[PDB]
């Protein structure tokens, strides 16, 4: 995974948060699949891939059982950009047996 080196605070923070925030959503005893999506209404300096990829790289770190999927995702983690802030929205969708 990511070598692990500070630098882009904008991200560093999002990590410490998305982690302790998604812990109960990705980190045991919770686990499962998910789908990350980068949403930005305005032009942002930080790349979208870096945000998505990374976010995913952290999810797995929590629980090895966690596996980001784009087909049968259980938890949708979207990242909206507002007032220059990382807005993480977790949506629980399960079309299985309603």
Answer yes or no: is 77 within a domain: yes
Q: Please tell me the distance from the alpha carbon of residue 32 to that of residue 48, in angstroms, as a whole number.
A: 23
Residue 13 covered by a domain: yes
CATH of the domain at 17: 3.30.2300.10
Decide: 17 and 59 in contact? Cβ < 8 Å: no
The answer to whether position 45 is within a domain reads yes
Other C-beta atoms lying within 10 Å of the C-beta of residue 1: 9
Report the domain count for the chain.
1
Asked whether residue 2 is assigned to any structural domain, the reply reads no
- Tokens at residue 55, please? 């976010």
State the Cα–Cα distance between residues 35 and 50, nearest whole angstrom: 15
Enclosing domain of residue 87:
7-93
């Amino acid at each position: 995974g990511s070598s692990g080196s500070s630098g882009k605070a904008f991200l560093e923070d999002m990590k410490k948060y998305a982690e302790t925030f998604l812990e109960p959503w990705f980190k045991a005893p919770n686990k499962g699949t998910f789908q990350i999506v980068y949403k930005s209404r305005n032009n942002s300096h930080v790349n979208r891939e870096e945000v998505i990829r990374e976010l995913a790289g952290i999810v797995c770190t929590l629980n090895s059982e966690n596996k980001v999927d784009l087909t049968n995702p259980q938890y949708t983690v979207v990242v909206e950009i507002i007032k220059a802030v990382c807005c993480l929205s977790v949506v629980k969708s399960g079309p299985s047996s309603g």
